[PDB]
């Protein structure tokens, strides 16, 4: 299959130069914008640092593929597998501390060096594994073959069963949290609006007392979901402070004066409630779109570098087109990250157009 090794490396070099240009662009936008540096920003920055560590040496892979076999020494190939390994596990543990920080930000420097140390531990465990096995007369560089296999198996078990299921648990918790918080603002605005129409239709059979008790329960929940913080709570104290005023007059049978206090229900609803329910809706919709960036960079890191890794283990423990289609997938992920940032990430789309119009 000479045409496979003939048509990989020009594509490899183009995704290499595109990835290194895009990631060096990412680091000069951090080098200019050092003010709003969030924890997400520095974690994806360390992911970018691992990406430019991986990004320089795809020409070595390209001229290894172009000659038909490996050219340099075995230590060079061990270094190449080591830097691919620190790229993979740096991405894994950086998304893991991303899950850490978004859990402790939504649900309720040193760790970057910890991520680098775990990466270099992975680099050592793939340093002791790699050797150029010249099988069938071709000097390829594939890791193949008692305590080392068991150590690799337990490291795989830890670094697959803990962080992947941790991603599943934390991201399902977030998308069941931020969807339910947006849902809780929907029925609270619904029964504050629907039952106000029932009150104006409640001259028939005294459905006034049944109606405001539904609004008494809903507007207590919306109060539970700083000078600006004082105005948020105070806008609901007069809202249900005129619900019981229209319930005191509902107990005495004054239905006509209950409707007179129902006209004051809409006044506080527009001047205090509709202002802050929309303001809470825009902030909630802003944080649910930043999750969509975090979800996309996680789910494509497991759709690109993971199926190439699961085909490396089965070919080492013991169909070449299945190997070939995976060997272009994980290496594509170095350049694929800045592609996903402009068309999904709403923050990066702002300063990218600002740089183009500088």
């Amino acid at each position, epitope marked *: 299959r000479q045409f496979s090794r003939a048509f990989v490396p020009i594509a490899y070099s183009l995704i290499c130069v595109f990835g290194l240009l895009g990631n060096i662009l990412v680091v000069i936008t951090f080098a200019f914008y050092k003010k709003a540096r969030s924890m997400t920003d520095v974690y994806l920055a360390n992911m970018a640092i691992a990406d430019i560590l991986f990004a320089l040496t795809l020409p070595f892979w390209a001229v290894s593929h172009a000659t038909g076999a490996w050219v340099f020494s075995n230590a060079t190939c061990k270094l190449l597998k080591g830097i691919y390994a620190i790229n993979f596990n740096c991405g894994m543990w950086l998304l893991t501390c991303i899950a850490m920080d978004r859990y402790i930000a939504i649900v309720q420097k040193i760790i970057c060096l910890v991520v680098w140390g775990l990466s270099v531990i992975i680099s050592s465990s793939t340093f002791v594994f790699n050797q150029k096995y010249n099988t069938q007369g071709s000097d390829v560089c594939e890791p193949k073959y008692r305590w080392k296999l068991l150590m690799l198996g337990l490291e795989l078990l830890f670094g697959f069963f803990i962080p992947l299921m941790f991603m599943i648990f934390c991201y399902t918790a977030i998308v069941k949290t931020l969807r339910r918080q947006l849902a809780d603002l929907e029925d609270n605005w619904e029964t504050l609006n629907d039952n106000l129409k029932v009150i104006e239709k409640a001259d028939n059979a005294a459905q006034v007392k*049944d109606a405001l008790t539904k609004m008494r329960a809903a507007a*207590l929940d919306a109060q539970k979901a700083s000078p600006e913080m004082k105005d948020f709570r105070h806008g609901f104290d007069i809202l249900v402070g005129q619900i019981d005023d229209a319930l*005191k007059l509902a107990n005495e049978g004054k239905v006509k004066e209950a409707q007179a206090a129902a006209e004051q229900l809409k006044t506080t609803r527009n001047a205090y409630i509709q202002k802050y329910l929309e303001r809470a809706r825009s902030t909630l919709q802003k944080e649910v779109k930043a999750i969509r960036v975090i979800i996309a960079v996680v789910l494509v890191f497991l759709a690109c570098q993971i199926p190439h890794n699961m085909v490396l283990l089965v070919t080492a423990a013991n169909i070449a087109y299945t190997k070939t289609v995976t060997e272009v997938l994980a290496f594509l992920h170095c350049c694929l990250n800045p592609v996903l940032y402009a068309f999904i990430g709403q923050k990066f789309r702002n300063y990218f157009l600002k740089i183009l119009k500088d």
Partner: antibody
Amino acid sequence: EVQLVESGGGLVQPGGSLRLSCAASGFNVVDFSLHWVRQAPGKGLEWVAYISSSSGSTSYADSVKGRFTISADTSKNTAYLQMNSLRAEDTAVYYCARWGYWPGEPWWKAFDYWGQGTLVTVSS
Amino acid sequence: DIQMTQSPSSLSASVGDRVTITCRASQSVSSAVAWYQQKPGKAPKLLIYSASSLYSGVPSRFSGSRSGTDFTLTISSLQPEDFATYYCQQYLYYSLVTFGQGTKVEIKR
């Protein structure tokens, strides 16, 4: 401390009348709504009535509407519950509890301080 | 018109056990549910207010939680003084307070 006592409990005939007192010391009636909670002997608690002294709003439960009369007196810091036509299900212990006013945290502390209540038994 | 159903009618556990009592409202009652403890021959005492905040004076072993319209009182460590009757109550309005059926916590034997 702030506390509430009750009085006026005893034995009446069916169809009779009885007025329980509820004396509150340490706090004013105009700052806290006053409730009567009824516990039948061996059965669960049941709310009966409330009076709001500032706004003059009184309300009753469905089993005691018309037969029961609640009132308050800020001069002696007392609340009175007057009952007429006491039927055979009305023998129970009556507790006098306080409750805060909206807004703020005293509305959330529902029935924080209770009285010991009085036994009202009806029989012929 | 709001009915609260207390699910355990009689509850039996010994000293040191963790017990839970659940109550369910008919409609939404927001976070306005209180939990009362009544010893036999005495007035009830307020334990939990606003379904999560323990009262100033009660011990810290009593806790409350809300899940929609399902309210839960949990005692982590039972004591000899903890054997009494427990009532759940919605307090959405002054004229709509309804109490639960009651849960009697006896001694496991």
